[PDB]
Design an enzyme around this catalytic site. Structure first.
Site, PDB file in Angstrom:
ATOM      1  N   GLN A  36     -78.388  86.022  78.117  1.00  0.00           N
ATOM      2  CA  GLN A  36     -78.398  87.345  77.362  1.00  0.00           C
ATOM      3  C   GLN A  36     -77.583  86.620  75.568  1.00  0.00           C
ATOM      4  O   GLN A  36     -78.421  87.786  75.411  1.00  0.00           O
ATOM      5  CB  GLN A  36     -77.501  88.288  78.673  1.00  0.00           C
ATOM      6  CG  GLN A  36     -77.483  89.536  77.340  1.00  0.00           C
ATOM      7  CD  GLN A  36     -77.502  90.596  78.066  1.00  0.00           C
ATOM      8  OE1 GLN A  36     -76.708  90.656  79.060  1.00  0.00           O
ATOM      9  NE2 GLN A  36     -78.141  91.710  77.805  1.00  0.00           N
TER      10      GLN A  36
ATOM     11  N   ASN B 143     -76.063  90.717  65.817  1.00  0.00           N
ATOM     12  CA  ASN B 143     -76.880  89.228  65.934  1.00  0.00           C
ATOM     13  C   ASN B 143     -77.400  89.880  64.622  1.00  0.00           C
ATOM     14  O   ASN B 143     -77.699  88.090  64.058  1.00  0.00           O
ATOM     15  CB  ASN B 143     -77.983  90.082  67.186  1.00  0.00           C
ATOM     16  CG  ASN B 143     -76.841  89.997  68.830  1.00  0.00           C
ATOM     17  OD1 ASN B 143     -75.609  89.749  68.920  1.00  0.00           O
ATOM     18  ND2 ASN B 143     -77.691  90.833  69.494  1.00  0.00           N
TER      19      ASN B 143
ATOM     20  N   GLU C 286     -77.408  66.591  56.124  1.00  0.00           N
ATOM     21  CA  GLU C 286     -76.692  66.413  55.668  1.00  0.00           C
ATOM     22  C   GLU C 286     -75.583  66.438  56.288  1.00  0.00           C
ATOM     23  O   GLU C 286     -74.224  66.426  55.876  1.00  0.00           O
ATOM     24  CB  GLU C 286     -77.232  66.996  54.279  1.00  0.00           C
ATOM     25  CG  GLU C 286     -77.800  65.804  53.695  1.00  0.00           C
ATOM     26  CD  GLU C 286     -78.643  66.561  52.295  1.00  0.00           C
ATOM     27  OE1 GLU C 286     -77.770  67.597  51.625  1.00  0.00           O
ATOM     28  OE2 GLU C 286     -79.140  65.655  50.956  1.00  0.00           O
TER      29      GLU C 286
HETATM   30  N1  LIG Z   1     -72.478  88.613  70.012  1.00  0.00           N
HETATM   31  C1  LIG Z   1     -73.061  88.968  71.436  1.00  0.00           C
HETATM   32  N2  LIG Z   1     -73.103  87.950  72.424  1.00  0.00           N
HETATM   33  C2  LIG Z   1     -73.418  88.684  73.761  1.00  0.00           C
HETATM   34  C3  LIG Z   1     -74.440  89.651  73.368  1.00  0.00           C
HETATM   35  N3  LIG Z   1     -74.708  90.558  74.227  1.00  0.00           N
HETATM   36  C4  LIG Z   1     -73.878  88.986  75.159  1.00  0.00           C
HETATM   37  N4  LIG Z   1     -73.037  88.333  74.491  1.00  0.00           N
HETATM   38  C5  LIG Z   1     -71.539  87.807  75.799  1.00  0.00           C
HETATM   39  O1  LIG Z   1     -72.090  86.931  76.065  1.00  0.00           O
HETATM   40  C6  LIG Z   1     -71.624  86.766  77.538  1.00  0.00           C
HETATM   41  C7  LIG Z   1     -72.372  86.057  78.599  1.00  0.00           C
HETATM   42  O2  LIG Z   1     -73.444  85.758  77.965  1.00  0.00           O
HETATM   43  P1  LIG Z   1     -74.539  85.083  79.148  1.00  0.00           P
HETATM   44  O3  LIG Z   1     -73.880  84.708  79.883  1.00  0.00           O
HETATM   45  O4  LIG Z   1     -75.767  84.995  78.295  1.00  0.00           O
HETATM   46  O5  LIG Z   1     -74.740  86.769  80.444  1.00  0.00           O
HETATM   47  P2  LIG Z   1     -76.155  86.684  81.222  1.00  0.00           P
HETATM   48  O6  LIG Z   1     -77.272  86.557  80.803  1.00  0.00           O
HETATM   49  O7  LIG Z   1     -75.790  87.709  82.412  1.00  0.00           O
HETATM   50  O8  LIG Z   1     -76.062  85.268  82.039  1.00  0.00           O
HETATM   51  P3  LIG Z   1     -74.743  85.350  82.502  1.00  0.00           P
HETATM   52  O9  LIG Z   1     -73.681  85.581  82.408  1.00  0.00           O
HETATM   53  O10 LIG Z   1     -74.302  83.628  82.957  1.00  0.00           O
HETATM   54  O11 LIG Z   1     -74.607  85.354  84.708  1.00  0.00           O
HETATM   55  C8  LIG Z   1     -70.775  87.888  76.990  1.00  0.00           C
HETATM   56  O12 LIG Z   1     -69.682  87.514  77.472  1.00  0.00           O
HETATM   57  C9  LIG Z   1     -70.694  88.491  76.076  1.00  0.00           C
HETATM   58  O13 LIG Z   1     -69.732  88.313  75.275  1.00  0.00           O
HETATM   59  C10 LIG Z   1     -74.674  89.660  72.138  1.00  0.00           C
HETATM   60  O14 LIG Z   1     -75.982  90.195  71.873  1.00  0.00           O
HETATM   61  N5  LIG Z   1     -73.724  89.694  71.116  1.00  0.00           N
HETATM   62  N1  LIG Z   2     -78.372  66.818  36.235  1.00  0.00           N
HETATM   63  C1  LIG Z   2     -78.133  66.820  37.485  1.00  0.00           C
HETATM   64  N2  LIG Z   2     -77.845  66.598  38.674  1.00  0.00           N
HETATM   65  C2  LIG Z   2     -77.733  67.007  39.819  1.00  0.00           C
HETATM   66  C3  LIG Z   2     -79.238  67.247  40.285  1.00  0.00           C
HETATM   67  N3  LIG Z   2     -78.646  67.692  41.379  1.00  0.00           N
HETATM   68  C4  LIG Z   2     -78.058  66.952  42.077  1.00  0.00           C
HETATM   69  N4  LIG Z   2     -77.145  66.528  41.314  1.00  0.00           N
HETATM   70  C5  LIG Z   2     -76.112  66.154  41.251  1.00  0.00           C
HETATM   71  O1  LIG Z   2     -76.037  64.785  41.970  1.00  0.00           O
HETATM   72  C6  LIG Z   2     -75.084  64.172  42.932  1.00  0.00           C
HETATM   73  C7  LIG Z   2     -75.920  63.669  44.141  1.00  0.00           C
HETATM   74  O2  LIG Z   2     -76.783  64.580  44.880  1.00  0.00           O
HETATM   75  P1  LIG Z   2     -78.204  63.930  45.061  1.00  0.00           P
HETATM   76  O3  LIG Z   2     -77.525  61.965  45.234  1.00  0.00           O
HETATM   77  O4  LIG Z   2     -79.416  63.873  44.649  1.00  0.00           O
HETATM   78  O5  LIG Z   2     -78.775  64.092  46.946  1.00  0.00           O
HETATM   79  P2  LIG Z   2     -79.244  62.957  47.638  1.00  0.00           P
HETATM   80  O6  LIG Z   2     -80.486  63.370  47.162  1.00  0.00           O
HETATM   81  O7  LIG Z   2     -79.030  63.208  49.218  1.00  0.00           O
HETATM   82  O8  LIG Z   2     -79.278  61.652  47.702  1.00  0.00           O
HETATM   83  C8  LIG Z   2     -75.199  65.595  43.036  1.00  0.00           C
HETATM   84  O9  LIG Z   2     -72.889  65.627  43.165  1.00  0.00           O
HETATM   85  C9  LIG Z   2     -75.164  66.827  42.620  1.00  0.00           C
HETATM   86  O10 LIG Z   2     -74.248  66.734  41.558  1.00  0.00           O
HETATM   87  C10 LIG Z   2     -79.787  68.023  38.975  1.00  0.00           C
HETATM   88  O11 LIG Z   2     -80.865  68.718  38.643  1.00  0.00           O
HETATM   89  N5  LIG Z   2     -79.555  67.817  37.445  1.00  0.00           N
END
Ligand SMILES: Nc1nc2c(ncn2[C@@H]2O[C@H](COP(=O)(O)OP(=O)(O)OP(=O)(O)O)[C@@H](O)[C@H]2O)c(=O)[nH]1
Ligand SMILES: Nc1nc2c(ncn2[C@@H]2O[C@H](COP(=O)(O)OP(=O)(O)O)[C@@H](O)[C@H]2O)c(=O)[nH]1
Ligand SMILES: Nc1nc2c(ncn2[C@@H]2O[C@H](COP(=O)(O)OP(=O)(O)O)[C@@H](O)[C@H]2O)c(=O)[nH]1
Lengths: 430, 195, 48, 431, 431
Positions: A11, A220, A246
């Site tokens: 749910q 939600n 990442e």
């Molecule tokens: N944040 C949030 N929590 C929810 C919501 N609805 C239910 N919950 C939580 O979900 C828990 C139970 O979830 P479910 O297991 O999915 O309930 P169910 O669909 O009747 O399935 P069963 O309980 O296993 O029979 C409850 O204890 C709530 O705390 C919601 O709309 N928002």
């Molecule tokens: N000067 C500059 N630095 C950047 C830019 N984008 C990212 N960086 C720096 O590059 C560093 C490493 O990022 P990067 O190597 O690109 O991540 P990867 O692509 O997953 O390998 C980060 O710490 C950023 O601060 C940019 O557009 N200009």
């Protein structure tokens, strides 16, 4: 092309998926009918020859009511009818029911549809599993499906956005039981598990949104905004793009320690909006405020291990660096000795879109802080006493035993959460 | 050598401070991750095409002329840039062909270097799982209920310590049994990294 | 045939959309109106 | 007729290279469609150094773009100057390296590196004579650092005598953008020390400081920092592309700067960087350029020259200038700051003059300093690497991509050896 | 003035011929009504190679269409150039051969073959001088294979000296269309070895790959495959139709390509086959054409040349080009890939140059390769034929048409002997 498969179990999973898919449709401009009046939707939607975009999502539940609400709701022509999977009997808040007896056929069909969906994706960044730790469907069926995905798909990154029970407030009685079981399960399958608490989000809505009567729709909506902030770098370009692959390497120090606090900023209603500057530094400080945590866990008791910041909108990198430098020089925020850097900044040029009818205001800047910190072991410490207090008298144990479960499983789950306690203590220690 | 010595020192101090075994440690879980990665790569490579995905393009267009490469454009013709998938079904790429195990690690000696241990009886931690299950069964047979008092906290053995690591999944056993012949074809022998 | 004309129209539309995205990227990349070095006004390159 | 093959690696490298190609295309009068529109003979005189003739009048950069994720070069193609590049030079994967140097060097880059070297060989063989390769990338990133180091190793193996130039964006001191920056940087420094012939060190926080003090920008994005880096990138090779009163190619600069083979890391700077407010107030003169050049704030590297001593320092001036003025200015600089200059090298300045300054500047000057100051930058990287390594934070990812643990040990040992070399030459006494 | 008699067999042959005649008429500037609207003198200079002049300005193709079912050439007439063909050249029966080589060669083909030879003789006697016949058809079909082979035998008996060129669509390796394809192919190859002087092997799967990897199409119908086949069929004979700097007719190509009489099966390819996106981005030069020409991906035969050895290879280039360029490119290819060329022939390339490129293209080049790689294709067809023949499945239809089971064995033996010859000359050593 950078597709992420969305799964919503139980749910709570399906009801947060409602907000998530409303938000994604509003963000990409996709109308509820299925089609919109480049290729930024491919991450969440697959376009057909007719022009209709169908979301790459799967609604799994053993109870028919919640899924039928979607089938009859405004989003009836958008979702795929077979993608909506409905069970016959609810798990009845029984982990054994949702994992051992009822969940088998449902999870088999779920893997069938998941295989079909993943076939339609050229690449696959990962899975976004939205479930509810604390209910049989969420706990049992979610754990089973996570095992299925981990074994078959393998090295695809699965992000489990789990909602644990709040410290004091709760709605279920066996919630400690099935929460301990599902945590015992997902400690080993999910790659990054995002922690959520209803009490914390309620407090957020009460103080920041000034909502004296918060409800699940508001909760939600907030969760959906957090997830959209997470995925903004996949769909929209911007300086310092951050990838799903990442996240783990920048955020997970050790395989077991992958539970993460999530915190959004700002959370301000329209009336309070445009009345404060909401600068990068101020929103960063708000994100690092203890009250902004979406889990009832004070960051001050622990020390931060890593903090990944997702900025959305008009954010300049010197501002993010200045704000984060002030954060480091702040005395309240404390990092571990062994992670001097501990910061993963990533910006994006797309400001957060606002859902009409919601309480969140149109803010040109947004931050989602997802932090691995040793403090979060406190919530597991709470559940570790909530569990054993009942287990001493073995209350409600016969219910779980009836659907193919044993005393050994309860004992092993308790052992494993104790192991997690020691793991958090040890990562906190020098 | 100096860093190895300090690893021993740091791990000993941490185990003393916390109370768990040096093997059952956050730092000493790298080899488990490596084994899981190798297993996932091998399981992905060893699948029949239906399990790999019933994609008409991937099945036919790549297979034609045994080219096994597909053109994925990144936009219009105006982008004109595309990915060559260059995927050969049923063969590990040379990059991932290598299996790695730590033979000098003192802590990994009981397992025997880890690696892939692709036979189902060898997956995960069979000895530890068997010992833990036998101890649990003996307690159950003698009627020794656990968790009698809440003031007694659990010992805290890890997933691998109790034999429920990720590599210990009953699905892992079932799927390796299903894919075994092709898994043998890809990796004929388990390296035995210990010796 | 009409197919070729429609294909040319689609290509022109694709060019226009790409130009719009390019303008967005240039505007987001550059922060101040004049050039940072060699102080001079800067515009979108265009020249097409 | 001495060609240069440009290569871009990772997101940071690709963005910087795209800005660099925009700058060079402007300097050579090339519109984004590739046609020459410079109305100046010297611009086409040496256009073959960076560009190749297409079927029409179009000119294509001799650039090769690498990545493991498609988003960055999708933005690059859709950028203002994305249409110049041949799409065959875009070698990309599907799953990016998650800021994992192991992923970018061993697992995912190894399959793509075959295509990378194929394109590199295709572009190089068409060259009449090859001065070398220049690779722009960032230390502290998975795909960038990993593929850059792997490609530099491959090109070093294939073309030992050809020049190897690298522009590495070293992680900033105070604020670390990614968590595993010390690991990636330590692994990449080990490769650059061994393979790269000539390497520039850049730091984002130093760039922020220079652009907020001297240029005084209010909201400097990466576009402006990439523009500064591109200005340095052009100025380092303008002697190849334009006639010079005292010209100096890349190999001449390398010979005059690198005293000992491994001390090839340099901090670079560009002058004159002026705020728009004081543009009219400043006097654009050779002494002004020299004084701004030797300012510690003008260096784009975090390390400040004052803590160290200059082993060597080259300055490529551009514009109609007096060689006597330039030489006298640099001699006066060395005499006044003899404490900051190495004693056992009688002259510590390599002055080059090009007759063609960049557009808008009557005069310009790029500075390339080999000083012992970079010791403290490497020291900070070592202090972070030791802290994370000691407990093995995030090391399991590098272990799981198939890298031995002692590869980190060897990288850190080599970096510490480099640090101690810089200290030894800083405190080395004549006779 | 060296006429060519075109013949089409089966639905595949008829559709390929329709596409080919459309392409040739476009090249010569002939509108679908037959009138010349080409506005270029060289187009009409040698139009008599393929066309005859009617009473008016109309030009009628020297084409003969064969079938046992009328629907295919009803569609051919409904096609865009369906009215240029003379209605008397349509020879077609009542009941089509049900993919039965025996039906198309013995029972139903015998009655129509008299009319077919009558039309062929009528067209050939009208020719001033006859170069020969070109027969386009598909192996693995009843009427196509059977009627084509029977007509080829009859024409070989009638005009032994004249060239016979065949464009046979051998059934595809992986994805087969009809069940009896190995039977029909095995029966047809045995006839083609004995009768056909020159034969080109085409594969629908190879055409799909060239249009998926070079042309980058999304949903390529049979029309696209026929378009590529038609382009090559034009390019092979464009030397007869247009002035050339170094011209080479079909007999010259056969002489320079066929070392031994039974080794006359060739793989063919066309350049430049280009995607839409990189049309501007591609450098259209003779070395680029050669690089695309010698690529295995350019071959329209499924067999890849890398496994085999090029016995001979002709390259007919089209465009205003440098003969030194072409010859140097060919020599460089031979020197570089000397492993892939047979040693006991000093020069394995027959280069020809025509001065008139195809419409729209600055340059073009068609390649005809006699290499031992086709051995693996015949081997695969035998691997299917033997498996089906061991259990004699579907053999009863052929047996009921009045052909001995001996014919299957003899055809298999002939194909195996051809495979043996290809292997022998693959592994033959000089001296
Ligand atoms: N944040 C949030 N929590 C929810 C919501 N609805 C239910 N919950 C939580 O979900 C828990 C139970 O979830 P479910 O297991 O999915 O309930 P169910 O669909 O009747 O399935 P069963 O309980 O296993 O029979 C409850 O204890 C709530 O705390 C919601 O709309 N928002
Ligand atoms: N000067 C500059 N630095 C950047 C830019 N984008 C990212 N960086 C720096 O590059 C560093 C490493 O990022 P990067 O190597 O690109 O991540 P990867 O692509 O997953 O390998 C980060 O710490 C950023 O601060 C940019 O557009 N200009
Ligand atoms: N390239 C191409 N191949 C075709 C075409 N039409 C049919 N074919 C193939 O030709 C093969 C043989 O069929 P065919 O000989 O025409 O049947 P028949 O004429 O009744 O004997 C079939 O397997 C088809 O796949 C076409 O238009 N182009």
């Amino acid at each position: 092309m950078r597709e992420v498969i969305s799964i919503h179990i139980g749910q709570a999973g399906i009801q947060v998926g409602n907000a998530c898919w409303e938000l994604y449709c509003l963000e990409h401009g996709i109308q509820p009918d299925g089609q919109m009046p480049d290729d930024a939707f491919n991450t969440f939607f697959s376009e057909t020859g007719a022009g209709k975009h169908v979301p790459r999502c799967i609604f799994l539940d053993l109870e028919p009511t919640v899924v039928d609400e979607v089938r009859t709701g405004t989003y009836r022509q958008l979702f795929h009818p077979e993608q909506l999977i409905s069970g016959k009997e609810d798990a009845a808040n029984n982990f054994a029911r949702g994992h051992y007896t009822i969940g088998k056929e449902i999870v088999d069909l779920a893997l069938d549809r998941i295989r079909k969906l993943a076939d339609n994706c050229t690449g696959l960044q990962g899975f976004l599993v939205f479930n509810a730790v604390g209910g049989g469907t969420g706990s049992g069926l979610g754990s089973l499906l996570l095992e299925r995905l981990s074994v078959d798909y393998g090295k695809k990154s699965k992000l489990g956005f789990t909602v644990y029970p709040s410290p004091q407030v709760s709605t279920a009685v066996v919630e400690p039981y099935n929460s301990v079981l599902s945590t015992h399960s997902l400690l080993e399958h999910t790659d990054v598990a995002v922690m959520l608490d209803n009490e914390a989000i309620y407090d957020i809505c009460r103080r920041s949104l000034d909502i004296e009567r918060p409800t699940y729709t508001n909760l939600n909506r907030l969760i959906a905004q957090v997830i959209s902030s997470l995925t903004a770098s996949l769909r929209f370009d911007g300086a310092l793009n951050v990838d799903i692959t990442e996240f783990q390497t920048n955020l997970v120090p050790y395989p077991r320690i992958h539970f993460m606090l999530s915190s959004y900023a700002p959370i301000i209603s329209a009336e309070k909006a445009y009345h404060e500057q909401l600068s990068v530094a101020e929103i960063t400080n708000a994100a690092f405020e203890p009250a902004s945590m979406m889990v009832k866990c004070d960051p001050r008791h622990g020390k931060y291990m890593a903090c990944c910041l997702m900025y959305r909108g008009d954010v300049v990198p010197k501002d993010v660096n200045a704000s984060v430098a002030t954060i480091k020089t702040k005395r309240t925020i404390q990092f571990v000795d062994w992670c001097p850097t501990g910061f993963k900044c990533g910006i994006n040029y797309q400001p957060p879109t606002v859902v009409p009818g919601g309480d969140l205001a149109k803010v040109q800047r947004a931050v989602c802080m997802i932090s691995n910190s040793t403090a979060i072991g406190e919530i597991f410490s709470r559940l570790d006493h909530k569990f054993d207090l009942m287990y001493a008298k073995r209350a409600f144990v016969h219910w779980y035993v009836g659907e193919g479960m044993e005393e050994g499983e309860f004992s092993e789950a308790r052992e494993d959460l104790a192991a997690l306690e020691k793991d958090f203590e040890e990562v906190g220690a020098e | 050598e100096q860093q190895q010595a300090k690893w021993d020192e740091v791990s000993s101090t941490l185990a003393y401070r916390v109370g768990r075994a040096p093997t059952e440690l956050a730092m000493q879980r790298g080899p488990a991750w490596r084994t899981r990665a190798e297993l996932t790569e091998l399981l992905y490579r060893a699948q029949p095409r239906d399990a790999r995905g019933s994609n008409p393009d991937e099945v036919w267009t790549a297979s034609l002329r045994d080219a096994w490469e597909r053109i994925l454009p990144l936009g219009s013709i105006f982008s004109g840039l595309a990915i060559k998938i260059r995927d050969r079904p049923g063969e590990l790429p040379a990059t991932r062909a290598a299996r790695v195990g730590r033979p000098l690690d003192p802590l990994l000696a009981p397992l025997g270097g880890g690696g892939t241990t692709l036979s189902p009886a060898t997956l995960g931690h069979p000895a530890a799982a068997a010992a833990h299950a036998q101890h649990v069964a003996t307690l159950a047979a003698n009627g020794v209920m656990l968790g009698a008092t809440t003031n007694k906290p659990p010992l805290g053995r890890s997933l691998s310590a109790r034999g429920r690591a990720w590599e210990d999944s009953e699905m892992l056993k079932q799927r390796v049994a299903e894919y075994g012949t092709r898994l043998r074809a890809l990796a004929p022998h388990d390296p035995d990294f210990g010796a | 045939s009409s197919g070729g004309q429609q294909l040319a129209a689609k290509d022109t539309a694709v060019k226009e959309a790409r130009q719009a995205r390019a303008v967005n990227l240039y505007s987001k990349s550059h922060s101040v109106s004049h050039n940072i070095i060699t102080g001079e006004p800067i515009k979108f390159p265009t020249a097409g | 007729m001495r060609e240069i093959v440009h290569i871009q690696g990772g997101q940071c490298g690709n963005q910087i290279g795209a800005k660099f190609w925009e700058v060079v295309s402007d300097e050579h009068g090339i519109d984004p469609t590739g046609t020459y529109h410079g109305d100046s003979d010297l611009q086409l005189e040496r256009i073959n150094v960076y560009f190749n003739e297409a079927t029409g009048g179009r000119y294509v950069p001799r650039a090769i773009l690498m990545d493991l994720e498609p988003g960055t070069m999708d933005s690059v193609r859709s950028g203002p100057y994305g249409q110049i590049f041949r799409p065959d030079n875009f070698v990309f994967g599907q799953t990016g390296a998650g800021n994992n140097w192991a992923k970018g060097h061993y697992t995912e880059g190894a399959e793509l590196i075959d295509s990378v070297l194929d394109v590199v060989r295709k572009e190089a063989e068409s060259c009449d004579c090859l001065q070398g390769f220049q690779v722009c990338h960032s230390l502290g990133g998975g795909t960038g650092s990993g593929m850059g180091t792997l490609l530099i190793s491959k090109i070093r193996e294939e073309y030992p005598d050809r020049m190897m130039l690298t522009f590495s964006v070293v992680p900033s001191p105070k604020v670390s953008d990614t968590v595993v920056e010390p690991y990636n940087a330590t692994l990449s420094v080990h490769q650059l020390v061994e393979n790269a012939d000539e390497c520039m060190v850049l730091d984002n926080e130093a760039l922020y400081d220079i652009c907020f003090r001297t240029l005084k920008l209010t909201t400097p994005t990466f576009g402006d920092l990439n523009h500064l880096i591109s200005a340095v990138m052009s100025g380092i090779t303008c002697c190849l592309r334009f006639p010079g009163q005292l010209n100096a190619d890349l190999r001449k600069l390398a010979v005059n700067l690198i005293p000992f083979p491994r001390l090839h890391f340099f901090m670079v700077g560009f002058t004159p960087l002026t705020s728009r407010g004081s543009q009219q107030y400043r006097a654009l003169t050779v002494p002004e350029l020299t004084q701004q050049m030797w300012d510690a704030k003008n260096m784009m590297c975090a390390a400040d020259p004052r803590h160290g001593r200059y082993l060597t320092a080259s300055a490529l001036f551009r514009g109609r200038m007096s060689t006597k003025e330039v030489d006298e200015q640099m001699l006066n600089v060395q005499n006044k700051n003899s404490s900051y200059f190495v004693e056992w090298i009688p002259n510590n300045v390599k002055s080059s003059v090009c007759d063609i300054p960049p557009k808008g500047l009557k005069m310009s000057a790029t500075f390339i300093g080999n000083s012992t100051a970079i010791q403290e930058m490497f020291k900070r990287v070592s202090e972070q690497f030791t802290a994370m390594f000691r407990r093995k934070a995030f090391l399991h990812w590098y272990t799981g991509e198939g890298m031995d643990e002692m590869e980190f040990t060897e990288a850190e040992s080599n970096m510490n050896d480099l640090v101690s070399e810089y200290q030894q030459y800083q405190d080395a006494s004549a006779e």
